[model samples]
Target: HHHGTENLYFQGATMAAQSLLSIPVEYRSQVWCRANLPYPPAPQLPIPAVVDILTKASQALPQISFSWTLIDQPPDGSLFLVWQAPTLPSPPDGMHFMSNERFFNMDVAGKVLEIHEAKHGFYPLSETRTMHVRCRYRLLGVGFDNFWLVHYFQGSETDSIPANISVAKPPHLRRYPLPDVKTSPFLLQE
Candidate 1:
């Protein structure tokens, strides 16, 4: 699917957490993190223009398993990068000076951090917001490619638990139960 088409961003370090936390587990498992690629209105703007920016890295980025959250986005008209894990690193953005290096451009050396970071990773550009984390990770050597999103991105401001998962709160401890056996009552003296 085209991950680049429908991308959204968090205002001020805001995250899709509300959108994520509200998703059903069944549905959440199928959600993919997409970059809201920057809309470079200018010719020199560093952006999706980099041939290998998000695309070239695609083959190597899946060195680890990732679930991504689109944490922030450029202003509406501003260009953003849309991402889908397993997309591997598609190509470098025009912004990176290293974009010119064909070998370095596709290098998986440091990009792993970015892919892993995509899992619930955020820019930390704020302090007050919960900054919803949309991605989580499991590390291995295999790649999970091209997951599809059947629903529109709806992890907005909804208030609800995403899963039916039940968590029973442990009973609070007030005091231990005392032995009440008639014979045990005398045993206490021992």
Candidate 2:
């Protein structure tokens, strides 16, 4: 006959529909209601229901900067260079970085002697962040003393810039060879 136990049992026995309505709308559906309860309107879908209805505008042009270094000098007198685009442009909002293509030309006397292409993309194992190019030319031949390394980004029509790398024939290569000696006649006479 405890008074507190009696009061607690009375409170538990008093079931009311108002208690169910007091719960937040998100959790109300889980509770059992004698009357039909309407669910809040469904949230709007963020993505388009039909793929064809979606459209996107072209992205802005990205900034590009790259540098080159001569890595090796082969015995054939060809130059091996490594061009690197260390940090490519980051994607804009809701977009991703796409592909990049570059063109290189070795110009001599207003004529392009050699042309090379390098491409980079998001493909697996096919991305070329660094490009290796080999340039072959005669050291002492015509139009070899000075030339320009012209570079351009394929995405833009404008040329990136040109670098002039000048090299004259080495003194050792220009030195005269030793004279042939007439040792057979001198030794026989002695």
Candidate 3:
């Protein structure tokens, strides 16, 4: 019975000795050796990957509305137009709206006229978020008219819907002034 236990212990010692002997003497000092494990080969990516990346990175366009108001009397009236920036659907994150040029058109007596350029430089919607444009009365001919405002962005542009503006003559300067006295002269004299 004791001989059987001794035989098993010697068999374990013999296997450990064989394992140590299998390793080269030069690598004996190393605790672990490097292994060339199998792995999937490098992938072959397509150029379209870049296209997809940029497509996702592109920003969204901001909404804009153009409007105008009369700022003064006929003699020195000025048309103040505003490019209302987006609010309901706000701009993309970390991005904003800007315009580098603006054009104004007027339809007078069935004729289209390029009235003015309200902006000629880079304008950003950071401080005011609204573009204020002023057109002098001289540029706006008298009488009812239809006008259009155009805005140019970095690369894209948009035109506003036709706006009806009535530039009428002042009452005092009307061609046919109405009578101020409505009462009968006979009644006053009596």
Q: Pick the candidate with the highest lDDT.
A: 1
* lDDT per residue as tens, model 1, 1-190: 4435223222331234344445554344334344332224322223233333334334444332232332222221232333334434422111111012111122243332122212111112222212222222221222322321111111223421222112211112112222221110000000
Candidate 2 Cα errors over 4 Å, as ranges: 1-112, 121-141, 145-190
**Residue-by-residue lDDT tens digits, candidate 3, 47-137:** 2432222222222111221111111111111212121111121111111223322344555454344433332121222222322332211
- List the candidates' TM-scores in order: 0.20, 0.15, 0.16
lDDT of 1: 0.26
lDDT of candidates 1 onward, in order? 0.26, 0.22, 0.24
Residue 84 in model 3: shift from native, Å?
Answer: 28
Which scores higher on TM-score, 1 or 3?
1
Model 1 poorest ten-residue lDDT run: 181-190
lDDT of 2 at 50: 11
What are the clashing pairs of model 2?
Answer: none
Clash count for candidate 3 is 0
Looking at model 3, residue 189 earns an lDDT score of 7
For model 1 the TM-score comes to: 0.20
Q: Candidate 3 deviates by what RMSD? A: 40.6
